[PDB]
Amino acid sequence: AMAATATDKIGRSVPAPGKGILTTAREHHSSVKYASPNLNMKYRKRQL
Amino acid sequence: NKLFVSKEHAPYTDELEEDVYLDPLARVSKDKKSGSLTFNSKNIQSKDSYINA
Amino acid sequence: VTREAQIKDWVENELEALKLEAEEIPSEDQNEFLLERTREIHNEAESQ
Amino acid sequence: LRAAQQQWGNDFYKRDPRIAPLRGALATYGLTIDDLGVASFHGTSTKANDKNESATINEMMKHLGRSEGNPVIGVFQKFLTGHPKGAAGAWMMNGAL
Known part of the structure; x- marks a missing residue:
């Protein structure tokens, strides 16, 4: 359902791992007070 | 002989390193002090x- | 341009569907819920 | 039609900042971040990796709002087999199935 490789920046220093993959969870929690309709299926089914 | 200027420190600082990583609208910006392009908290x-x- | 007609009137059918929803379910803590759903509709319109 | 599907069924979180790629990866089956049962770690057995690999798994559950007290279960395939420098993720995807 998902595959994603990730890297910091330019090939700089190989033998040390880092944050890279954490970006597979980049989402925005600035305003979570309202409900996001797209997460429901009963709503996405009606549009379809 | 200054075409290739190797970065020394990333646009984010370690305390902001993972805060950037999945707040996906995190845009770098100018720093009035340093002049470089770094991430602000x-x-x-x-x-x-x-x-x- | 034919599908754009389907998409144009689609939001005018969607934003009106917020008014039957957005001024009856919540209180006047509204311009944060509206700016949550009116953006999502605007974005669900773009990717449409 | 198979274009309206991927708008509302498969790639409905692409053009959305507030649905993480891993959350919408599962949210397309009615799964939640809580249903991510297991995490087959790379688990290379180096002192820097396992400290870091475990670290990063935490935040992406810490950030996605995994239920407190619902941890993922570390599967460390490499204790048997070792590190097949390149073959790794295909042994641990092999086992994960």
Whole structure:
């Protein structure tokens, strides 16, 4: 359902791992007070 | 002999390193002091840019 | 341009569907819920 | 039609900042971040990796709002087999199935 490789920046220093993959969870929690309709299926089914 | 200027420190600082990583509307910006392009904690998951994009 | 007609009137059918929803379910803590759903509709319109 | 599907069924979180790629990866089956049962770690057995690999798994559950007290279960395939420098993720995807 998902595959994603990730890297910091330019090939700089190989033998040390880092944050890279954490970006597979980049989402925005600035305003979570309202409900996001797209997460429901009963709503996405009606549009379809 | 200064075409290739190797970065020394990333646009984020370690305390902001993972805060950038999935607040996905985190845009780098200019720093009035340093002049370089670095990430500020003032616009990382700042909810003004976090939905209008 | 034919599908754009389907998409144009689609939001005018969607934003009106917020008014039957957005001024009856919540209180006047509204311009944060509206700016949540009116953006999502605007974005669900773009990717449409 | 198979274009309206991927708008509302498969790639409905692409053009959305507030649905993480891993959350919408599962949210397309009615799964939640809580249903991510297991995490087959790379688990190379180096002192820097396992400290870091475990670290990063935490935040992406810490950030996605995994239920408190619902941890993912570390599967460290490499204790048997070792590190097949390149073959790794295909042994641990092999086992994960």
